[PDB]
């Protein structure tokens, strides 16, 4: 039938255009910095140099006489107990990955993994079983507690 | 002996990094005298380690015992 | 249409070596 309109992608073209764009950005930045930093008698007087040294030496003589936080906790409120204190570490996140911060406790996380394994062994709204793979339970933590 | 055989014939990280040859990334043909010799991900900006792949020492060329005797 | 390679003899009327390579 009729083929619709759409550009062709070319990895050489993409890389060359990116490099050329970066070079143009560098040119603009250098032109800006030329304006930014380009706006800056006693040059060869040795007798006045000695006089200024003397006045510099004499000048010293004349001057001689944390509750605040907005982090999220990947746990349920029910997962905590009462009448006891729990330590909350930080979850592993890559430096390049810009996802939000996640604070978890290793013991509760391990318990969740163990119970998840037990449940998944125990099994041995449109197409949810395969959607959960193609697609966790936490709470916003503000003002030192929800 | 088998451990040393596996070390000599094992895939050094620089060797295994050269086998990977990227995808959809044209590179300038190195070694004019014989093209088709591309180092792949070795020294490539596509993927790999941030630090340069350090050279191994187990794969260093070695002379025979009888030849060293001749020396 | 066929994949056979056609000799560019007589196909050089409007082309140069250095063109499209700068």
């Amino acid at each position: 039938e009729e083929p619709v309109t759409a550009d062709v992608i070319n990895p050489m073209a993409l890389r060359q255009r990116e490099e050329l764009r970066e070079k143009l950005a560098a040119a603009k930045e250098k032109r800006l910095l030329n304006q930014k930093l380009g706006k800056i008698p006693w040059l060869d007087d040795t007798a006045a140099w000695i006089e200024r040294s003397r006045q510099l030496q004499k000048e010293k003589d004349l001057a001689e006489k944390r509750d605040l936080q907005g982090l999220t906790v990947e746990h349920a409120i029910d997962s905590f107990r009462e009448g006891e204190t729990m330590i909350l570490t930080l979850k592993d996140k890559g430096v390049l990955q810009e996802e939000e911060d996640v604070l978890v406790n290793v013991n509760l996380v391990d318990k969740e993994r163990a119970e998840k394994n037990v449940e998944l062994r125990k099994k041995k709204a449109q197409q949810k079983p395969r959607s959960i793979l193609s697609k966790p339970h936490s709470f916003r933590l503000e003002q030192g507690g929800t | 002996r088998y451990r040393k055989m596996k070390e000599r014939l094992g895939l050094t990280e620089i060797r295994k990094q050269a086998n990977r040859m990227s995808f959809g990334e044209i590179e300038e043909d190195a070694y004019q005298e014989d093209l088709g010799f591309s180092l792949g991900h070795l020294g490539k900006s596509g993927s790999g380690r941030v630090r340069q792949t350090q050279v191994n020492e187990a794969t260093k060329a070695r002379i025979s015992k009888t030849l060293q005797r001749t020396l | 249409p066929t994949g056979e390679v056609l000799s560019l003899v007589g196909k050089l009327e409007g082309t140069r070596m250095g063109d499209k390579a700068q």
């Binding site: 944390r66 509750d67 605040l68 936080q69 982090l71 906790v73 409120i77 905590f80 107990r81 009462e82 009448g83 006891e84 204190t85 729990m86 330590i87 909350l88 570490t89 930080l90 592993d92 996140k93 890559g94 430096v95 390049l96 911060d101 604070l103 290793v106 709204a125 449109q126 197409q127 395969r130 959607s131 793979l133 193609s134 933590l141 030192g144 507690g145 929800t146 | 990280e13 295994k16 990094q17 995808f23 993927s47 790999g48 380690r49 941030v50 630090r51 340069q52 350090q54 | -």
Partner: protein
């Protein structure tokens, strides 16, 4: 299988016999059937579907391309105002063709060529050639044939629709394309036949197998960075749960000597830093590079293992001046976060 050979390409024949082994074909057809059977089971009351039947058919119906038969059949609770035969991308059927009780769906698979990879034409053409047939057996004039192109991962459906059936098929197929055990294993076999992989770069991972080679005469540093940013959180018996940040500690344990270098991490360093995770990521790297530059050359570590994979990246930059230092990630959930307890 159902792949057709326009010429004996023996290498391709061997490759496709290897790829479609374990009767992947019949299994992929059955997997497409049953999970597509499931979606109608959920929305059967909403579509006046009395029952959904998956009749026992010839096991080789998956690749029997000359003839065909129904495999999923809907028995209606009441008459449906069936629509005209139309494609899956259509939206113009005003849904007034006829009235039927039985409603079949036929699923046919394809490994399309380059020229003939038009799946919708395939579907409509053999819907016409299987309904206007004397060898194909379809219980009712109404029905839709669904065509799956494995080689190009295309999906189409042409035939009769009852109210609400077409969008439901659209959504179900959009989900089934992106996730299905049979199609996933087919994709994996194709990937390993071409040996084209996505990411998964090779590094020495500390694991249960290579755990023995750790015990060597070269000094090793176990950089553990879990206990850097941590807050004591506790839910009181009646009052709301309250939090208080506390100090962290980097672990630079050395199995050879046991000298656990430990930089106490004051809470003041986090002076309202928005991206605190990355700051914690490079704060440990700063101290480990400082310690490496601090120790004498014979005491410099020749191998740094790391508990959490995120820390693999920063070290290589702060170890950019030390190319001879191997930085190995650990698959081992190695218990050093509890060392601070």
């Amino acid at each position: 299988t159902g792949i057709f050979m326009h010429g004996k390409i023996p290498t391709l024949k061997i490759s496709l016999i290897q790829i479609f082994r374990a009767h992947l074909w019949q299994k992929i057809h059955e997997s497409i059937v049953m999970d597509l059977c499931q979606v109608f089971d959920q929305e059967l009351d909403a579509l006046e579907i009395e029952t959904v039947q998956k009749e026992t058919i010839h096991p080789r119906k998956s690749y029997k391309m000359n003839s065909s038969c129904a495999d999923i059949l809907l028995f209606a609770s009441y008459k449906w105002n069936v629509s005209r035969p139309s494609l899956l991308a259509d939206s113009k059927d005003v849904m007034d063709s006829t009235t039927t009780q039985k409603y079949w769906i036929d699923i046919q698979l394809r490994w399309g060529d380059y020229d003939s990879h038009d799946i919708e034409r395939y579907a409509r053409a053999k819907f016409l050639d299987y309904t206007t047939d004397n060898m194909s057996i379809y219980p009712s004039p109404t029905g839709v044939l669904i065509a799956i192109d494995l080689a190009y991962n295309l999906h189409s459906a042409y035939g009769n629709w009852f109210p609400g059936s077409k969008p439901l098929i659209q959504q179900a197929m959009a989900k089934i394309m992106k996730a299905n055990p049979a199609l996933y294993v087919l994709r994996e076999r194709i990937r390993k036949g071409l040996q084209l992989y996505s990411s998964e770069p090779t590094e020495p991972y500390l694991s249960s197998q290579n755990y023995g080679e750790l015990f060597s005469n070269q000094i090793i540093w176990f950089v553990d960075d879990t206990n850097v940013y941590r807050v004591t959180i506790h839910k009181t018996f009646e009052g709301n749960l309250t939090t208080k940040p506390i100090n962290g500690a980097i672990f630079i344990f050395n199995p050879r000597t046991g000298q656990l270098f430990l930089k106490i991490i004051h809470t003041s360093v986090w002076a309202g830093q928005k991206r605190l995770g990355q700051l914690a990521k490079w704060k440990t790297a700063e101290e480990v590079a400082a310690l490496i530059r601090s120790l004498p050359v014979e005491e410099q570590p020749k191998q740094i293992i790391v508990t959490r994979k995120g820390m693999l990246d920063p070290l290589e930059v702060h170890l950019l001046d030390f190319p001879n230092i191997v930085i190995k990630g650990s698959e081992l959930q190695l218990p050093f976060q509890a060392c601070l307890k």
